[PDB]
Amino acid sequence: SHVSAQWVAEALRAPRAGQPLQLLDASWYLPKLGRDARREFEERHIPGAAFFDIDQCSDRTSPYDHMLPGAEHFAEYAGRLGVGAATHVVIYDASDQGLYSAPRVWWMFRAFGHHAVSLLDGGLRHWLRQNLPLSSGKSQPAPAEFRAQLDPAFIKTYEDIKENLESRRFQVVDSRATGRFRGTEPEPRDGIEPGHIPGTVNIPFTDFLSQEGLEKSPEEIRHLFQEKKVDLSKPLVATCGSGVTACHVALGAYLCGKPDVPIYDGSWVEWYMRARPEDV
């Protein structure tokens, strides 16, 4: 479920009984962009939206940022943002690319057992170009009761990726920019070198998106995967810098008929730290 701006605009005008919408802004940026996602939500957001913060809704113990939270934590947090069992969640972000971190939160809702979840195609960027209405300020919806349960099949761990270098049970696509993957541009985290996990295929997340910031068609995405030597009939896992834009690979495959693309949540930052490549 990709929904258009026009879909969301009508959903706002015309709710349907017993099945409320909750818009979430899940904007998140690497530090080097200098953006503050939460302050930007307060400057502007789509009316009714709440801010979903991927760095707060995450594992409380791990030293890695935005690792999947426990189910109880996820349910508490989503509930406090006004998402209940009956809620159709629609997620966007305000990225320059159209959607950047929203797919991650779409993927998290699915992983915790909530399938009534969609993505606003083109995000706030497209919304703004359409001259659609904005609100501002902090936005606190009525608390709701949410039940969550993690399906572990949505996740791959370091060990899984490590053992897969031998067994090759699944294909692995990395959605980072070509420069970071190939090791010719820096990783934007302190201490981490660029490069890639051996045997992975680079499909920058930007390849799934138009010039205008809109998701490509299912057939275009199909051909993208073909041109990259990835076979959608065999198992497929996605990885990136830190488990965020890898969810674009999961989304692209989903829209092609493949809903089972687990994410290496730890991603390059974990791989670099544990595997300690000396390559680059």
DSSP bridge partners of 238: 173, 263
Topology of the domain comprising 1-150: Oxidized Rhodanese; domain 1 (3.40.250)
The listed CATH number (3.90.1150.10, 3.40.250.10, 3.20.20.70, 3.40.50.300) that belongs to domain 151-280: 3.40.250.10
* Active-site residue flag, 240: yes
Write the CA distances from 4 to 92, 143, 194, 205, integer angstroms.
11, 27, 36, 20
Q: How far is CA 53 from the centre of its chain?
A: 12
* End-to-end CA separation in angstroms for the chain: 40
Resolution (A): 2.2
Residue 225: HSE in the Cβ half-sphere, 13 Å Cα cutoff:
28
Helix/strand/coil for 35:
coil
61 touches 277 (CB < 8 A): no
Obtained via which technique? Answer: X-ray
Helix/strand/coil for 172:
strand
Domain with CATH 3.40.250.10 in the chain: 1-150, 151-280
Residue 128: HSE in the Cβ half-sphere, 13 Å Cα cutoff:
14
134 touches 44 (CB < 8 A): yes
Question: Token match 């195609």: residue?
Answer: 121
Residue 28 structure tokens: 């998140």
DSSP bridge partners of 90: 23, 118
| Rounded Cα distance, 98 and 251, in Å | 14
Instruction: Find out whether 60 is annotated in a ligand binding site.
Output: no
